[PDB]
Amino acid sequence: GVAEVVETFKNPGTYSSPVINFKIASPPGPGTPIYGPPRDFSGYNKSYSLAIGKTSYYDPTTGTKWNDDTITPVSDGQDIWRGWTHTGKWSFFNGKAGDKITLSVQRDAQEASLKGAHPGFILFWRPEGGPLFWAGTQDLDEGQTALPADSDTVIGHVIVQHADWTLQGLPPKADHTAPAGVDTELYPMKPDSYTMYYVDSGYDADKYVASKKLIMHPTAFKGLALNDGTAGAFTKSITLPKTGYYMLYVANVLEVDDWSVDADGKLTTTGEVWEVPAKGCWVNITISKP
Ligand SMILES: [Ca+2]
Ligand SMILES: [Cu+2]
């Protein structure tokens, strides 16, 4: 397509344009948060470690599915589980159109021998050119005049992995703008909407155990699978289509003997590959040039 998924703003709500944080590194679970340096990959040849939730990339626990209507046959694109926006981890970078870079994600050195990670990513372009403060959204509706440090808005709490992502019906904004280098006929700057433009996405499809399976759609994401023979890591060449500000989401795909979702939306599994101590696995994200 790619598909475009268009959300309706509601606050409080799932599609409330919540803030994400570029420093938070700790896994999901009952534990208090830990923060590290902000994940800014600008200039490239940079690398940061953080934890990602067990099923975060393709996540039945979200209770939310989308349909990719660009797929033929239509049925092959229906009932796609979303990812979880906040049990994955966010990063950003500034770059130039034509920059040829390499994105690699693998297990952090501290968990290098512990099986569990199958990292996946989504890369978005934000034509606005930088962090987008939007008054009246979930975390900016108490008189804030700017984003909190090292933070940015994204559309909602559950995320689509192979689509342009649009939010409309936002509290009207008079300074939703983009730099002059942006064609606002192709990339409109509306007073009540914004779009995170799909650039690329993919996940580590190399299984630790050949007999097992991934918690992953049977057909909708066949083009997203990355196979390099190494379980727990992927690497991919990306040529930036545009100059400006990019937002990168990384999250996990779980490997199991079997998995199921019951009528109450409860996820059950057996034979999980999950040897790490926490409810999230530690990975290192690197963007290299070349
Ligand atoms: Ca791999
Ligand atoms: Cu969330």
TrEMBL record:
Residue stretches making up the Copper(I)-binding protein CorA domain: 30-260
Lineage: superkingdom: Bacteria
GO terms for cellular component: extracellular region; outer membrane
The protein's name: Surface-associated protein
